Amino acid sequence: NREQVFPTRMTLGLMKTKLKGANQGYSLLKRKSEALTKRFRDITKRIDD
Amino acid sequence: AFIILDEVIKVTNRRVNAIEHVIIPRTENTIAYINSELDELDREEFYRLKK
Amino acid sequence: NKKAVEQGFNVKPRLNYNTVSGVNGPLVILEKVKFPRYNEIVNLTLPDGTVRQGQVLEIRGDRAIVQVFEGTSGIDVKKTTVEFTGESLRIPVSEDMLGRIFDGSGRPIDNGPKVFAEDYLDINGSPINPYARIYPEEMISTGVSAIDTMNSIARGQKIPIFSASGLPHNEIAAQICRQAGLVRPNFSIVFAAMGVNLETARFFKQDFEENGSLERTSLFLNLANDPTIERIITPRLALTTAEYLAYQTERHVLTILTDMSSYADALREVSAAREEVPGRRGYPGYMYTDLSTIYERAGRVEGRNGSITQIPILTMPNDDITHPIPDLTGYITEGQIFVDRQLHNKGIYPPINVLPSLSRLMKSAIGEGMTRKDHGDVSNQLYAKYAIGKDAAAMKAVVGEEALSIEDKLSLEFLEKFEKTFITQGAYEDRTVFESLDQAWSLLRIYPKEMLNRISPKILDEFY
Amino acid sequence: LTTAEYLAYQTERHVLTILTDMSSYADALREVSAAREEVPGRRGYPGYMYTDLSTIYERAGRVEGRNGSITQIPILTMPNDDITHPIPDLTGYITEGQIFVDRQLHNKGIYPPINVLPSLSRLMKSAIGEGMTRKDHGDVSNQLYAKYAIGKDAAAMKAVVGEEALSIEDKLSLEFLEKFEKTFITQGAYEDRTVFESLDQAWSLLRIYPKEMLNRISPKILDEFY
Amino acid sequence: YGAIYSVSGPVVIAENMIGCAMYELVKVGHDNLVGEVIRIDGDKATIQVYEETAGLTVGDPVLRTGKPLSVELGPGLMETIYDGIQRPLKAIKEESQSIYIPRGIDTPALDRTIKWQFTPGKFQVGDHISGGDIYGSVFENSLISSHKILLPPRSRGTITWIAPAGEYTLDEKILEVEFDGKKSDFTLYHTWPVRVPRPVTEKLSADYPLLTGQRVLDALFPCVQGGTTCIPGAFGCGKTVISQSLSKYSNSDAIIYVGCGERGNEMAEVLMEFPELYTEMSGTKEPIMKRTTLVANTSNMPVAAREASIYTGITLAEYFRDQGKNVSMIADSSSRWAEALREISGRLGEMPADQGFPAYLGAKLASFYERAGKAVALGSPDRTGSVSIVAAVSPAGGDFSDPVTTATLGITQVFWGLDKKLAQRKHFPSINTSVSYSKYTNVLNKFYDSNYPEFPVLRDRMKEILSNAEELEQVVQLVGKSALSDSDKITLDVATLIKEDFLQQNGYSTYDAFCPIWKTFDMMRAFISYHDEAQKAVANGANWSKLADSTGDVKHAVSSSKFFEPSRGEKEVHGEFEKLLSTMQERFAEST
Amino acid sequence: YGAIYSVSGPVVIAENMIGCAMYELVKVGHDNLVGEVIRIDGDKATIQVYEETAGLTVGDPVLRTGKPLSVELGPGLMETIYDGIQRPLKAIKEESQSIYIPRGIDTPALDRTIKWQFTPGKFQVGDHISGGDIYGSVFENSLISSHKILLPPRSRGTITWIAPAGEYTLDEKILEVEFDGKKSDFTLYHTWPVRVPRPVTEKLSADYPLLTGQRVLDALFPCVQGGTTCIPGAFGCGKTVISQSLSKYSNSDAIIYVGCGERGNEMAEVLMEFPELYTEMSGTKEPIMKRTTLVANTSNMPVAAREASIYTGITLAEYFRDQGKNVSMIADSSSRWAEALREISGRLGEMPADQGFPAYLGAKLASFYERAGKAVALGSPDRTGSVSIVAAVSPAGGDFSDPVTTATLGITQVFWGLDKKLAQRKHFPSINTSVSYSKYTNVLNKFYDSNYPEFPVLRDRMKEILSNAEELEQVVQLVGKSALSDSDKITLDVATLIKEDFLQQNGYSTYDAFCPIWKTFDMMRAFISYHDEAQKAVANGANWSKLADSTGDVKHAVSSSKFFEPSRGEKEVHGEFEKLLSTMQERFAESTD
Ligand SMILES: Nc1ncnc2c1ncn2[C@@H]1O[C@H](COP(=O)(O)OP(=O)(O)O)[C@@H](O)[C@H]1O
Ligand SMILES: [Mg+2]
């Protein structure tokens, strides 16, 4: 339930950078999933037509 | 296009869930533990300086 | 008959030391002390007439560093008068303590008389001889399935209740006290509140009164308003009373030490008042020993029919096992009952997460003789399948519900019907251990006979 | 601050003290504290840095009988580009706002390299009003902040879902972000922009949006100024 | 008497101080700077002076007050503005004619020049008197009339002489009590040590609620007179609205607002807004300041003052509780107080415990919160006051993992949870219903069954509706919204209506300034009845879109249930709510 | 006899005590509390007493024994329980008639009333005798027969008189040595200072394995007879149960179970269960307790006595090694010993070093763990004993970064790390197969080649399977199981089977309480053969899902091999395993066909 990181100030900064990047990637990928799902709904409607 | 798009959407949703439920909690727990250990080292240094 | 009376009929004058060298924090230092003891509880008289008790902690030549439980506040060099009793802190105990409410330091707040002492026992106590101990092998049917089947409390067990700040640990502890009883045949509860809220103390007192336990309960209430230094001695006083009533009276005693987190916070405050080692998270390096002198007063002894079961109620700060209070208490005590905020938010009562919970004294005190043959295998299998359920729930959250296998789906169903129907209980519902085991066998019969790999083949054939 | 107190309160004039390198001031506090036998606090700085910074900062403020004011621009220097450091933490506790200078903006040649997303003034509603500034100030600032956040989101979104798949409210927002960073935030070091000229530039930036899109602006101000 | 021996920053060592007590306030220096005694080593007595210590030379006399840090309890505490040390800011400004606080200013904490009307109590000469007994009454304000004069809790004995009715300045003798020697002479005031809680005969259970007026606060997350709550208290979260409401629209007969380390312009804002308040307790509008005592305490004040601000406030609240008045204490910037305590601990050199906070922070917080509660006041006559502590945590660094925030959340039974995002979304009072909670519902069930029996189940069902709507919103974000069933659509619509009308209360608006408990109960009844009617219509098989089209009138009536004015009150609003329930049932049934 | 100057916690600074050496045993107080001198600041001499300091007064006399803390070695201890300062708890209970240990009770460490049948050794009158030479033997009990009486080290000379065969107490003279014209009288017992290790002729490389009985400990991370061991883990991980099972079922001839900072109910459980258990060694069923002695120091006992208990236990183990017996000392918690050291250092006022633990903690641990090792005893006749140290380090907070854990891992050779995620969900032993290691596999290759040749290759295959499946488990937790290949599916399934059946060993069931070396080897053979057969069948082209559906019976038979009773004998069970493998091969061939 954690990462085997040696406690250090540099390691703390690296892990904060990792958390910020992961949050940014999570928001970006959630928005991309929403956009792709809108495109997918359009695609399936065109499939029915 | 429908099949490829569905596969890509499944992969992307899986990766979003994986991030939000593993990477964010694991990194947050690592941050908390590193902060606690840094506070512990600071407290040990404080006690040594007090001595 | 009893020769302890003869030494009682002796009067010992006490020296009143107006010589107070200095005072700092909670520590008041005396000078010109004539042969100071190491734990002589003194009676320090304030200039205003208030009398606060204190015990010396370090005694250099002609010097004694007294810490006062009520606090130094108001102590003046010129007017304070400190008399040395010449003996360590001794609680006046008797069989009449049962049914009386005492303060943090043992002074009766029940509006009744001072306890008519039958003996004066040192609160610090003595270690029980390990050769004189008896391994607790008598199961207690607490009535709650999560503690009786998954875990198991013996009679001499000292299993605490790990919980967070807002969890219903108090309601669980009161449930155990009102339902505790030997599986194969009463408990004189000794309750020690340390820094609890008035609401918590009132709840415990009202529960005992309404369940009738107040006729056999001796409360040692140390509220949050009470001084923070006598939280150190409140569990000592209650445990000395319990040790008396158990070993020297042959009464089975439940010792409920509420807010051991508050006790340990008082311990850290006392340590930080001195130049003590900071241990981990600021708690003293001797914390383990202190908590040992608290917890290890439980257990049964050879030749004496009494027993003491300690159910300390911890308050983990951030619901973290790794915190020093839960870690040290788990290292010392003989198990733990892990109250879970996740299950409490889910709405389950009792909110016991059985995975972090454990009981050393299940090994013996469950089996073919104490209860039915299948209990150990059933508990092991239930633990395994509950963990598989939690892991499969995490996998479902990560990668959707379709990717799960048949085993994962079965394990999710088991998890749902185990948390919903087995762990969950009413506040006043008591389940016999056999009924709990039958529910457990229903939950295992969710599975096919092949997947119950922790069940022995004979038990599985005879019980499936 | 003693000079500021004198001028503002015994002379009735407005001051605007501009302190510089309060990180250097905290280092001097560290040196002075360790000159005595004081044990270092959280990050080596004394435990009373909160008190010292509180005195220095709260030396300012308006008063009742005197028609003078003192304003402060402490101007910190964050050591490792973090707010968790004691100097920024305490400065944010005592003070009443933040203005953030960003390395990302500085590396793009944008002067002043101030990013308006982390920066805020808690007392902005009082300063930006109708009798003060011009009556569109608050709504214009809120709209600029919202559209700048949308511009950053769209800039991150373009490299993920392509430029074409962006909505109109994302493409126009990208254009607004480019014009905002390269013309509004980007200010000549010796270019004096009054509040009215800056607000006119802000309206010029906002005018690329049709009036229907500007939603944080009140209808009356939108109908009058657009 | 005493004399200075060593000055190294705030810490001062004074020699020739034999007989000086611990934590006792001493007048340090020729300017009579106030400081307490930290430790004693023989003659010496380490003193931490409160004000700035520059200029104190060796040989400066150190007069010993003889008493610990004490609150100046008496008439004239009500509409004054104080600090942590309880120094009158208005009187200091008037006396010094300067915007600054002169160093070592010793203005009396209560107005001695003002004359108070004193009416002797039931006690007469020769009758026994005990601590906390009311031996007189003083007319102080219009909101707070008959400011009951209390014998000091420690004092007791036989009454020797009691002053007759008339006007008497706070500093002159009012009562003489002989207890093994008539050494007691009592004025209109008494001094009580701040750290020592004022004793009570018995501390009852907090049963009656604290009706703050805000619908969400007094419906879903209620607080009790004598209960302790918590508030995030961050910037731009509605903390001002919550404080204003609790100050003027609550049940409290008195208000103690403490700042304990707030920012200068925030203090300016609160001390400029509170005198502008008006509470319509009587027919004529009168200021809320007539019943609200301020402890104004910025960051320039001594760290000792900032650490003692909440203690002084709770002692004032305890005093007004001993008079039988329900008191509400708003402890803004509790964390600021914790930071001041940490700074004091660092000055001591005491070992840090967690994140640098002292070892005893949790114990001090628990004791301070336990000092709050309903209690029957000491001595005769029997009267039961209560102290409510509403402490805005204002976490340091914007995180709830701080030791002080964790301790406050654990100890306080109610968390009201102002939401910064919801406040930014133009919502008031911006209460995050997902994280806010109240543990006083179990004890309030008695009052609710006594007055409004269905209110607990109504609020529980409203919380269930909101939680189900959150789940349905998550589902509608994950997949298509139209895939949701009719029941889910009704849940979403009714919960959106509840958020818009029931939860969003406009303080500025006249109709929603203070919604009484009866009107809140009636609105809960109306909303739950509308939800039940919609659920019954769905069960009947009617399309939800058609049902909404037909019952738009009932929905408009439910929305206007906000707009019903509590000015008429009592049966007029209740009767109109009874009529609204009849219309809702009829229109819903007609659509079927 | 000096006075007392200060009593702060467990340390007692004693004034007017010039002439007291470092680590000299003293009798502090009127109750004669046993203590050891730490510092000597002139006249004063700081003393760490091994009893409770409550009631000590300034001025109370302190006597200087003139000796270091000395354990008492000889017949008697084998089946007893002690108290760190080596006070027999049984004798204390009988003498005091109370359930508490009296303060400053001075009961002899070894019972003097018992008469031991002494048979003189090969040394006769006039023959030169050196330190550690065996001049006789006594019958301690049924299991420890011929408890060889060793002449104390550092003592040499010519035997002037040796007692004949008969029954003697410990006080009676047994042998007399003349050295440089000075006669020395030797008895059945002799005291040895615990701090100084007992001398040996030459320490040897350990080559025989210490059969713990646990499957994972025996196969994956083996330990030798004479090798140090460490078992870190949080509370509830299983270090205590692992230690108790090792003491019950190890092949070591003698067990020294040391309890430092361990709850007394564990000592009671040992004292109750060990007599019921029986050892198949010595040709007859003899109780385990006849070869196990306990050095019990409960957590609530005096703080300073934990170090004394460690040293007493290791010195008893060294004595039984010098007798030629393969001993295995088991410290309950070297971490609790280290916590006691930290408490003493903080009471003294020394520099905290790391986490408050004194700066000499690493050196003390290194010395204590270097006490262990296979060695030839000091004197004739030639014999080769050993001492294994299985010490359960208990980290604070469950983090293996603790100073005591790091120093213990630096000094030890075997790491049986415990995972709490496996401690929960009842997966004992909770040995974390990833971090755990054992550096004795290279030296045990000889034993494996001698007895079970395929043991190292099967063990390496199991380690590879577990590591590969751990990587695949990370991959599947990240991106699901759809991407994994067939062989990946077999690897994951077989490793889950291994963890559920082979590694998971219930120490309190009849079948898996003690899995012997041959049963563990057969089970590795079965599981590895199952993995190989599944891999071969899938490589032949059979779909893994259908193969699993068809061979569920074989998988259940493999998983149920842990239920085979070791009591049935090696011949009977090995036949059952051979039949299981044959039927497994037939079933896999039929499924493939
Ligand atoms: N091999 C095993 N078989 C069965 N149960 C075990 C085994 N190892 C440990 N346990 C269980 O773990 C529990 C905790 O004991 P243990 O973890 O050994 O104490 P410690 O916390 O000192 O390590 C015991 O109740 C025991 O039932
Ligand atoms: Mg253990």
In 10 A of CB C453, how many CB atoms?
A: 17
- E19 and E65 Cβ atoms separated by less than 8 Å: no
Q: Which long-range contacts (CB under 8 A, 24 or more apart) does F122-125 make?
A: F122/F381, F123/F159, F123/F162, F124/F159, F124/F162, F125/F159, F125/F160, F125/F161, F125/F162
- Please name the member of F89, F101, F235 whose beta carbon is closest to the beta carbon of C327: F235
C252 forms bridges with which residues in the sheet?
C307
Closest CA to D133 of D198, D85, D87: D198
DSSP F78: G
Indicate the helix (H) or strand (E) that contains C115. none
Token pair 């990013």 in the structure block, residue: D115
Closest chain D residue to A34, measured at CA: D161
Which of F428, F505, F512 has most ligand 1 atoms within 8 Å of its beta carbon, as the pocket-test mutant?
F428
Q: How far is CA C21 from the centre of its chain?
A: 39
Task: Check contact D-C (3+ Cβ pairs < 8 Å).
Answer: no
Pairwise CA distance, residues F278 & F272, whole Å = 13
Pairwise CA distance, residues E277 & E290, whole Å = 10
Closest ligand 1 atom to Cα of F506:
3
In 10 A of CB F124, how many CB atoms?
A: 11
| Cα dihedral E131, E132, E135, E138 sign | positive
Structure-token pair, residue E547? 């049902």
Q: How far is CA E19 from the centre of its chain?
A: 38
Reduce the DSSP state of residue F279 to 3 states and report it: strand
Pairwise CA distance, residues D62 & D68, whole Å = 7
CB B15 to CB F352 under 8 A? no
Closest CA to D29 of D55, D65, D64, D59: D55
CB B46 to CB E351 under 8 A? yes
Closest CA to F82 of F58, F103, F107, F57: F107
DSSP D134: -
Closest ligand 1 atom to Cα of F507:
3
In 10 A of CB F571, how many CB atoms?
A: 8
Q: How far is CA C210 from the centre of its chain?
A: 22
Residues 1-51 of B with CB under 8 A from D: 42, 46, 49-50
Structure-token pair, residue E397? 């660094």
- D71 and D127 Cβ atoms separated by less than 8 Å: no
Chain F interface mutation, best of B30, B38, B43, B44, highest count of F Cβ atoms under 10 Å: B44
In the structure, which protein residues have their CB atom closer than 6 angstroms to any atom of ligand 1? C 358, 360, 362-363; F 235-241, 428-429, 505-508
CA of C353 to the centre of ligand 1 (A): 18
E71 forms bridges with which residues in the sheet?
E192
- F265 and C299 Cβ atoms separated by less than 8 Å: yes
Structure-token pair, residue C198? 């008035």
The count of C-alpha atoms lying within 13 angstroms of the C-alpha of E282, restricted to the half-sphere facing its C-beta, is 12
Question: B25 contacts in A (CB within 8 Å)?
Answer: 1
Residue type, E234: A
Token pair 């101007």 in the structure block, residue: D75
- F503 and F495 Cβ atoms separated by less than 8 Å: no
Closest CA to D59 of D120, D9, D25: D9
C235-257 burial by CB neighbour count: b if 16+ within 10 A, else e? bbbbbbbbbbbbbebebbbbbbb
DSSP structure string for E357-406: EETTHHHHHHHHHHT-S-EEESSSSP-EEEEEEEEE---GGG-TTSHHHH
Pairwise CA distance, residues D8 & D66, whole Å = 8
Pairwise CA distance, residues D24 & F145, whole Å = 79
Q: Is C116 exposed, middle or buried (0-12, 13-18, 19+ CB in 10 A)?
A: exposed
DSSP D39: P
Interface of E with D (CB under 8 A): 8-9, 99, 235-236, 263-266, 268, 298-300, 303, 336, 339-340, 342-343, 345-347, 349, 356, 396-397
Pairwise CA distance, residues F103 & E373, whole Å = 48
User: Which residues are CB-contacts of E16 (< 8 A; sequence separation ≥ 6)?
Assistant: E1, E2, E3, E43
Pairwise CA distance, residues C464 & C449, whole Å = 8
User: Which residues are CB-contacts of F86 (< 8 A; sequence separation ≥ 6)?
Assistant: F71, F72, F109, F295, F312
- F148 and F123 Cβ atoms separated by less than 8 Å: no
In 10 A of CB D194, how many CB atoms?
A: 8
F376 forms bridges with which residues in the sheet?
F202, F384
According to DSSP, the β-strands at F254-262 and F292-298 are parallel
In 10 A of CB F570, how many CB atoms?
A: 13
Closest ligand 1 atom to Cα of F263:
22
- E207 and E447 Cβ atoms separated by less than 8 Å: yes
Question: C278 contacts in B (CB within 8 Å)?
Answer: 43-44, 46-47
Cis ω before D112 (30° cut-off from 0): yes
Pairwise CA distance, residues F492 & F471, whole Å = 10
- Please name the member of E22, E363, E406 whose beta carbon is closest to the beta carbon of C318: E406
DSSP C127: P
In 10 A of CB E90, how many CB atoms?
A: 16
Indicate the helix (H) or strand (E) that contains D110. none
Closest CA to C230 of C220, C218, C217: C220
Pairwise CA distance, residues C209 & F559, whole Å = 54
Q: How far is CA D26 from the centre of its chain?
A: 22
According to DSSP, the β-strands at F182-186 and F175-179 are antiparallel
What angle is formed at CA E249 by the lines to CA E246 and CA E250, rounded to 5 degrees?
Answer: 60
Residue type, F27: K
Q: Whose CA is nearest to atom 11 of ligand 1?
A: F238
Distance from CA of A46 to the nearest CA of B (A): 10
Indicate the helix (H) or strand (E) that contains E101. none
Pairwise CA distance, residues E268 & E270, whole Å = 6
Going along F195-288, which residue ranges are E strands? Answer: 202-203, 228-230, 254-262, 278-279, 286-287
- F10 and F53 Cβ atoms separated by less than 8 Å: yes
Q: How far is CA E544 from the centre of its chain?
A: 46
Pairwise CA distance, residues F548 & E6, whole Å = 86
HEC string for C7-32: HHCCCCCCCEECCEEEEECCEEEEEC
Structure-token pair, residue C390? 């939690």
The alpha carbon torsion through C161, C165, C167, C168 (nearest 10 deg) reads 70
Q: State the structure-solving technique.
A: cryo-EM
Question: D42 contacts in B (CB within 8 Å)?
Answer: 42
The Cα-based distances of C48 to C226, E176, E352 in angstroms read 20, 20, 33
Going along C182-298, which residue ranges are E strands? Answer: 190-196, 218-223, 252-258
F299: left (phi over 0), alpha (psi -120 to 50) or beta: alpha
Reduce the DSSP state of residue F456 to 3 states and report it: helix
Structure-token pair, residue D98? 């933040």
Q: Give φ, ψ of F514 to 5 degrees.
A: -150, 100
How many Cβ pairs closer than 8 A exist between chain B and E?
10
Closest chain C residue to E440, measured at CA: C199
Reduce the DSSP state of residue F211 to 3 states and report it: coil
The count of C-alpha atoms lying within 13 angstroms of the C-alpha of F349, restricted to the half-sphere facing its C-beta, is 7
- Please name the member of F354, F356, F478 whose beta carbon is closest to the beta carbon of B18: F478
CB C280 to CB B40 under 8 A? yes
Pairwise CA distance, residues F526 & F522, whole Å = 6
Token pair 């019907």 in the structure block, residue: C417
F73-112 burial by CB neighbour count: b if 16+ within 10 A, else e? bbbbbbbbbbbbbbbbbbbbbeeeeebbbbbbbebbbbbe
Question: D80 contacts in A (CB within 8 Å)?
Answer: 13
Task: Check contact F-D (3+ Cβ pairs < 8 Å).
Answer: no
Reduce the DSSP state of residue F43 to 3 states and report it: coil
What angle is formed at CA E171 by the lines to CA E165 and CA E172, rounded to 5 degrees?
Answer: 45
What angle is formed at CA C320 by the lines to CA C318 and CA C321, rounded to 5 degrees?
Answer: 155
Q: How far is CA F210 from the centre of its chain?
A: 11
Pairwise CA distance, residues C330 & E200, whole Å = 40
Q: Is C10 exposed, middle or buried (0-12, 13-18, 19+ CB in 10 A)?
A: exposed
User: Which residues are CB-contacts of C307 (< 8 A; sequence separation ≥ 6)?
Assistant: C136, C138, C155, C156, C246, C252, C253, C299, C300
Question: D156 contacts in A (CB within 8 Å)?
Answer: 24, 28
* Relative orientation angle of helices D49-58 and E334-348, to the nearest 10 degrees: 120
CB D93 to CB E8 under 8 A? no
Closest CA to C127 of F288, F54, F494: F54
CB C321 to CB F426 under 8 A? no
Closest CA to E60 of E89, E15, E28, E85: E28
Closest CA to F366 of F197, F505, F533, F516: F197
Length of chain D: 226
Structure-token pair, residue E145? 């009339």
CB D40 to CB B50 under 8 A? no
Pairwise CA distance, residues F83 & F392, whole Å = 19
* Relative orientation angle of helices E334-348 and E403-411, to the nearest 10 degrees: 130
H and E: helices and strands count for chain F: 16, 28
Closest chain A residue to D155, measured at CA: A28
Closest CA to D94 of D43, D31, D33, D52: D52
Pairwise CA distance, residues E576 & E523, whole Å = 11
* Relative orientation angle of helices C287-295 and C324-332, to the nearest 10 degrees: 50
Pairwise CA distance, residues C383 & C390, whole Å = 11
Residues 30-49 of A with CB under 8 A from B: 30, 32-33, 36-37, 39-40, 43-44, 47
Closest chain B residue to A41, measured at CA: B2
Which value in Å is the resolution of this experimental model?
Answer: 3.3
CB D40 to CB B46 under 8 A? yes
Q: Give φ, ψ of E560 to 5 degrees.
A: -70, -15
The count of C-alpha atoms lying within 13 angstroms of the C-alpha of F445, restricted to the half-sphere facing its C-beta, is 6
CB C38 to CB F480 under 8 A? no
Pairwise CA distance, residues C427 & C144, whole Å = 9
- F86 and F72 Cβ atoms separated by less than 8 Å: yes
C327 in reach of chain F (CB within 8 A): yes
Residue type, D71: T
Pairwise CA distance, residues E9 & C300, whole Å = 58
DSSP F11: E
